[PDB]
Amino acid sequence: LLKRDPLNSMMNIPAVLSRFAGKGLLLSENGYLRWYVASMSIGAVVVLALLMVL
Amino acid sequence: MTITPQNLIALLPLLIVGLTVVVVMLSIAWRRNHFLNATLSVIGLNAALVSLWFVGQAGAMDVTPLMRVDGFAMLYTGLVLLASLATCTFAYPWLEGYNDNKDEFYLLVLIAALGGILLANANHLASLFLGIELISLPLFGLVGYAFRQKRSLEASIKYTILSAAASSFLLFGMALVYAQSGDLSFVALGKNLMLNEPLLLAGFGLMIVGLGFKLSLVPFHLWTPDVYQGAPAPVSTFLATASKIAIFGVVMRLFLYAPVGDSEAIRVVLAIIAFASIIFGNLMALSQTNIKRLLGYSSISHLGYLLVALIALQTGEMSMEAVGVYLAGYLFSSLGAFGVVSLMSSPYRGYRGLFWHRPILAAVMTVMMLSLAGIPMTLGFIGKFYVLAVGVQAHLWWLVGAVVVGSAIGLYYYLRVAVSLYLHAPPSNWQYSAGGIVVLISALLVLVLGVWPQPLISIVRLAMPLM
Amino acid sequence: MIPLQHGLILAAILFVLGLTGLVIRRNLLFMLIGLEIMINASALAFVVAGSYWGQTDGQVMYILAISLAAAEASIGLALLLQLHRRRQNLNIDSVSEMRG
Amino acid sequence: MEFAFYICGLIAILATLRVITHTNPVHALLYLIISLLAISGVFFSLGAYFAGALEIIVYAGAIMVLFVFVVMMLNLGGSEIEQERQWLKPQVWIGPAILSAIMLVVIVYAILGVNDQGIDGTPISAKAVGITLFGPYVLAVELASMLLLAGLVVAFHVGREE
Amino acid sequence: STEVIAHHWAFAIFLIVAIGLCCLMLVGGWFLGGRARARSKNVPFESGIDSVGSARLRLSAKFYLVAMFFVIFDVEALYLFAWSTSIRESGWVGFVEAAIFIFVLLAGLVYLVRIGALDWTPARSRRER
Numbered sequence: 019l020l021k022r023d024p025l026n027s028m029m030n031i032p033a034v035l036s037r038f039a040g041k042g043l044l045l046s047e048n049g050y051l052r053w054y055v056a057s058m059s060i061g062a063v064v065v066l067a068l069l070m071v072l
Numbered sequence: 073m074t075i076t077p078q079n080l081i082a083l084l085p086l087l088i089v090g091l092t093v094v095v096v097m098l099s100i101a102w103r104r105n106h107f108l109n110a111t112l113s114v115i116g117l118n119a120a121l122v123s124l125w126f127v128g129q130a131g132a133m134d135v136t137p138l139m140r141v142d143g144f145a146m147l148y149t150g151l152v153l154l155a156s157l158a159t160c161t162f163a164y165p166w167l168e169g170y171n172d173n174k175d176e177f178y179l180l181v182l183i184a185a186l187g188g189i190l191l192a193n194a195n196h197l198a199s200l201f202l203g204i205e206l207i208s209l210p211l212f213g214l215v216g217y218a219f220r221q222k223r224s225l226e227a228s229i230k231y232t233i234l235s236a237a238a239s240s241f242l243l244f245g246m247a248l249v250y251a252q253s254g255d256l257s258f259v260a261l262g263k264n265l266m267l268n269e270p271l272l273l274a275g276f277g278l279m280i281v282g283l284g285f286k287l288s289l290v291p292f293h294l295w296t297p298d299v300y301q302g303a304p305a306p307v308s309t310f311l312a313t314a315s316k317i318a319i320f321g322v323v324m325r326l327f328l329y330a331p332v333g334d335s336e337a338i339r340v341v342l343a344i345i346a347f348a349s350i351i352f353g354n355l356m357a358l359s360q361t362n363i364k365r366l367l368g369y370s371s372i373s374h375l376g377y378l379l380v381a382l383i384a385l386q387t388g389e390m391s392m393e394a395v396g397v398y399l400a401g402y403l404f405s406s407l408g409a410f411g412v413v414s415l416m417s418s419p420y421r422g423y424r425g426l427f428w429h430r431p432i433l434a435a436v437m438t439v440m441m442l443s444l445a446g447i448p449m450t451l452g453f454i455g456k457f458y459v460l461a462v463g464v465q466a467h468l469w470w471l472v473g474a475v476v477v478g479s480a481i482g483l484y485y486y487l488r489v490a491v492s493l494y495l496h497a498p499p500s501n502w503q504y505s506a507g508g509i510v511v512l513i514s515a516l517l518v519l520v521l522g523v524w525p526q527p528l529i530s531i532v533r534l535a536m537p538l539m
Numbered sequence: 540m541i542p543l544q545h546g547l548i549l550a551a552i553l554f555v556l557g558l559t560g561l562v563i564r565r566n567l568l569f570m571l572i573g574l575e576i577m578i579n580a581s582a583l584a585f586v587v588a589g590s591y592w593g594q595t596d597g598q599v600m601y602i603l604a605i606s607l608a609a610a611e612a613s614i615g616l617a618l619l620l621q622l623h624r625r626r627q628n629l630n631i632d633s634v635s636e637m638r639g
Numbered sequence: 640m641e642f643a644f645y646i647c648g649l650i651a652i653l654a655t656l657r658v659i660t661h662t663n664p665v666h667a668l669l670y671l672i673i674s675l676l677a678i679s680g681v682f683f684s685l686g687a688y689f690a691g692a693l694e695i696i697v698y699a700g701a702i703m704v705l706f707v708f709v710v711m712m713l714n715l716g717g718s719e720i721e722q723e724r725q726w727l728k729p730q731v732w733i734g735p736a737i738l739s740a741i742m743l744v745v746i747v748y749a750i751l752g753v754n755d756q757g758i759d760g761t762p763i764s765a766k767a768v769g770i771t772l773f774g775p776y777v778l779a780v781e782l783a784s785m786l787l788l789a790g791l792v793v794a795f796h797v798g799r800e801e
Numbered sequence: 802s803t804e805v806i807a808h809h810w811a812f813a814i815f816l817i818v819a820i821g822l823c824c825l826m827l828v829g830g831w832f833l834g835g836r837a838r839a840r841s842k843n844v845p846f847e848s849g850i851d852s853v854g855s856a857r858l859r860l861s862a863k864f865y866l867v868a869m870f871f872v873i874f875d876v877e878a879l880y881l882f883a884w885s886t887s888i889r890e891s892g893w894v895g896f897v898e899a900a901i902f903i904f905v906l907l908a909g910l911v912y913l914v915r916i917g918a919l920d921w922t923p924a925r926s927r928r929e930r
């Protein structure tokens with residue numbers, strides 16, 4: 019049961035999480051300019067809202 | 073208040089760069105000679121670099137309602153001048169293969185260096201805005217220099233539209249701030265204040281949006297891999313080094329000299345932006361097969377580390393020297409890496425197993441890849457150690473945890489590139505040799521100041537502005 | 540006698556309309572037109588800010604704003620002429636070959 | 640003075656809205672001219688006579704070259720309007736509309752939270768602006784000249800046919 | 802005072818009467834005179850023969866480079882407009898700043914002239930030989 023080294027896979031879990039998160043985040047770099055301007059506007063709204071709530 | 077001759081003595085790099093801009097213009101108009109205008113640009117940049125000594129012998133003075141000159145401005149002026157000199161040195165062998173005119177490149181580089189110097193000396197909102205635009209516009213020219221190539225035109229259009237939008241955002245936030253306070257000076261933001269008022273906070277948020285675009289900060293970071301890949305390699309070198317150095321220097325000047333830096337909400341949103349920038353920039357470069365996009369995400373992560381060093385400026389007094397040391401190390405490492413990329417891309421026509429045909433460039437590239445990872449015996453480790461010490465001193469535990477995680481991810485992809493340099497793959501002109509010497513001295517400086525960092529600490533701490 | 544808030548609200552309305560024209564429009568010429576609208580709106584906000592305090596700083600910032608506007612308009616117009624010359628259309632969503 | 644400012648502001652808002660939601664490029668340029676005329680009227684009502692003067696002086700030439708480039712490429716009859724119409728869809732414009740609305744209401748919340756004393760409408764002549772421009776603000780003028788030179792060099796380098 | 806509101810009213814009446822007079826003569830021109838009917842009345846005038854294509858073709862203006870230079874030079878002109886109204890109070894130092902500004906302006910103009918820009922005429926129309 020232990021010959022697969024379960025603790026090694028348990029500690030390799032965050033490497034899989036990092037790979038999945040990086041592959042998910044790379045989908046945002048589609049290369050479209052209008053999406054880039056929309057994302058800049060989204061970030062401006064987000065930072066302004068965070069400044070208003072505090 | 074009027075202009076004294078001592079003010080022009082302190083104004084030596086700006087006047088020298090403007091004079092050599094005019095001289096390069098007139099020499100281009102007289103005759104299209106690549107070597108003559110290139111030598112003129114290098115001579116002017118070196119003249120500004122050695123006039124920094126006379127600026128230091130003059131002293132620190134508030135030369136304009138706009139400008140203030142001290143060791144801070146001196147250090148950042150020297151950094152952007154070194155970046156511009158390396159950009160010209162890498163650009164000349166690349167420009168040897170350009171079928172079109174090769175003379176406007178050095179003019180645009182000199183004008184962008186002038187904008188960087190004016191950003192380093194900025195103590196006014198108007199100077200800050202003008203320096204940002206004077207960095208951006210020659211970068212619009214240089215990014216789309218090879219407009220026959222598709223990707224350069226793509227990066228030029230994207231950078232121009234996005235930077236015009238960010239300039240509009242920054243200018244609107246500037247106008248809201250000026251409506252709140254009534255003075256555009258860097259020391260009179262909120263002097264009439266109850267430091268939290270929504271109009272000033274919104275104006276500073278919009279300037280944060282603009283500067284975070286200019287510093288490749290999340291979520292205004294999506295342009296960085298595209299613009300870095302599309303642009304020519306010396307242009308990528310300049311955009312990675314000089315623009316980031318100058319804009320972060322003026323950001324630190326704004327956040328140090330203003331009383332608005334004591335506000336908790338701006339510090340909280342800057343911590344959020346720094347966390348997101350580090351994690352996103354490190355995670356996005358995991359599966360990158362292209363070196364330019366990988367270095368763009370690297371720039372995002374390193375600017376996140378600089379953000380972490382900047383957030384704790386109000387609490388500790390050692391944050392500014394940490395940013396100076398990190399920016400010196402980052403400048404040298406980016407110069408070496410992008411110089412190896414540029415020398416591999418020169419001359420312009422239109423890295424696996426690099427050691428077996430170009431061993432010295434492979435050595436420089438793997439040294440700079442070790443340096444960018446924060447590994448000891450290199451300068452990037454000294455910068456990361458300074459950032460971690462600054463974060464620990466002001467008790468920013470989420471930020472230092474993000475720094476550790478991002479450093480591990482950067483370790484993975486940087487060392488992957490480093491071993492790929494030494495696997496098995498399936499010039500002859502003194503300008504190329506000069507570029508090789510430049511990247512070799514960059515690697516040697518990184519190694520020597522990683523082993524023995526104390527002289528760099530002494531030079532950085534001696535660059536002390538008005539507290 | 541004229542509220543500063545109404546002028547700032549007018550400038551904000553023009554700025555967000557320029558950004559709406561920047562994002563939702565696909566032809567590059569209308570993105571440049573929207574960029575002109577935002578830079579004029581930020582300049583307008585600077586003039587209202589300078590007129591509230593009775594200073595020339597807002598007008599000088601307006602001058603710098605429209606100098607930047609003219610220079611960026613010329614640069615974007617040259618880039619758009621290049622795009623139309625080497626592509627024969629002004630679709631900005633086809634500029635997407637650089638991704639990932 | 641309130642009447643002129645408010646009417647010009649309403650005209651500017653309406654003309655900008657008609658600019659960003661139009662398919663005809665020449666009509667869009669005409670509404671842009673109307674909007675900038677209204678902006679200059681707003682400038683004139685606030686006492687900044689030089690600002691409105693430069694808004695009509697230098698943007699009449701700016702939109703003129705925009706008309707030149709519109710004639711150069713965009714005019715093709717009804718085909719260009721038809722092509723521009725397909726790019727605009729109800730979902731396409733309803734997407735960022737709520738983003739622009741929430742940004743506008745956040746900025747309005749920020750604006751209303753500041754103190755007010757009213758703009759007195761005292762005129763500011765071009766003499767004072769010239770004194771401040773070539774007085775305390777030397778380097779803004781000189782490096783703005785260098786910035787415009789840089790933009791001119793970029794325009795020459797990019798805009799060449801061959 | 803009274804002179805200022807009198808001048809404002811005079812200017813407003815000048816605008817109103819000018820626009821109304823233009824509209825009135827346009828209406829009088831449109832309403833007076835009988836109309837003409839012809840088979841080829843609603844055809845663009847092209848010297849008496851039908852057109853090839855239409856007049857809505859895209860036309861490559863050769864002076865577009867000069868146009869995007871003209872915007873920049875217009876902004877330099879506005880800077881000199883701002884300077885020229887306050888020469889006496891600017892002093893000799895302000896004259897030095899404007900001399901540097903204008904010297905950069907002619908340096909850019911000589912650069913534009915010498916590199917082949919501001920010259921879009923064809924080789925057959927350059928009046929050589």
Ligand SMILES: CCCCCCCCCCCCCCCCCCCC
Binds near residue numbers: 060735
């Ligand atoms: C072919 C590619 C087309 C790209 C079009 C991009 C359009 C983006 C529209 C974004 C609209 C956002 C509306 C608000 C969402 C919620 C708030 C922001 C996220 C938290």
